[PDB]
Design a protein around this ligand. Structure first.
Ligand SMILES: NC(=O)C1=CN([C@@H]2O[C@H](COP(=O)(O)OP(=O)(O)OC[C@H]3O[C@@H](n4cnc5c(N)ncnc54)[C@H](OP(=O)(O)O)[C@@H]3O)[C@@H](O)[C@H]2O)C=CC1
Ligand SMILES: Cc1cc(CSC(=N)NC(=N)N)c(C)cc1CSC(=N)NC(=N)N
Ligand SMILES: [Mn+2]
Ligand SMILES: [Mn+2]
Length: 159
């Protein structure tokens, strides 16, 4: 199964200048929790945004140009990326925008962090068809001393 995981601000903004224009420790925790011990697929800009392999997960980078770091696995197509994961129960697509778009249709699950924050962005999560998804998990949280925004974790499964 292929899953997409992301954090969306208002208007589905997910990034600005290769970065997440917010500070939410709780979302990073949720991310580590739902990706640990699973292969992660990401675009190259998203690879450069992190600078180092995510610990305890197989890192697959999608790029049309030759790979430049052997600490990770480089692939040149969606199909090679999926094949590179082998036989695992779940494949986590962690971004960015152009990669989400490509993997969305093969997706069976969406892990979304809805952040109540307005932020100018240059990158947006795909405009998915709400009718095709079913909310199977929803957990809302008010802002607190560590997390400056109210946010909600949601898991959608393709109907
Ligand atoms: N808020 C959230 O949850 C998230 C936010 N982000 C944010 O997303 C933004 C980066 O997103 P964006 O610019 O779209 O970039 P991506 O990370 O999606 O990078 C895309 C790059 O990877 C390669 N690639 C993608 N698809 C293919 C394919 N099918 N075949 C071959 N190569 C492919 C290409 O690199 P090449 O040029 O080498 O061909 C392409 O330019 C940043 O702003 C980041 O901070 C990212 C993940 C989650
Ligand atoms: C650390 C990091 C992780 C990601 C992947 S996050 C994700 N797919 N899902 C989710 N958050 N729930 C991304 C896209 C970017 C980063 C680094 S962000 C950053 N560097 N911000 C900044 N420079 N201030
Ligand atoms: Mn049901
Ligand atoms: Mn069904």
């Amino acid at each position: 199964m292929i899953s997409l995981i992301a954090a969306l601000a208002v208007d589905r903004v997910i990034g600005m200048e290769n970065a997440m224009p917010w500070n939410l420790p709780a979302d990073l925790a949720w991310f580590k929790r739902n990706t640990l011990d699973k292969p992660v697929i990401m675009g190259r800009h998203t690879w450069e945004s992190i600078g180092r392999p995510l610990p305890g997960r197989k890192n697959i980078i999608l790029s049309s140009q030759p790979g430049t770091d052997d600490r990770v696995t480089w692939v040149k197509s969606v199909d090679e990326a999926i094949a590179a994961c082998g036989d695992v129960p779940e494949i986590m697509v962690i971004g960015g925008g152009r990669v989400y778009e490509q993997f969305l249709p093969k997706a069976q699950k969406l892990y979304l962090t809805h952040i109540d924050a307005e932020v100018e962005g240059d990158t947006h999560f795909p405009d998915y068809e709400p009718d095709d998804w079913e909310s199977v998990f929803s957990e809302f949280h008010d802002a607190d001393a560590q997390n400056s925004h109210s946010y909600c974790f949601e898991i959608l499964e393709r109907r």
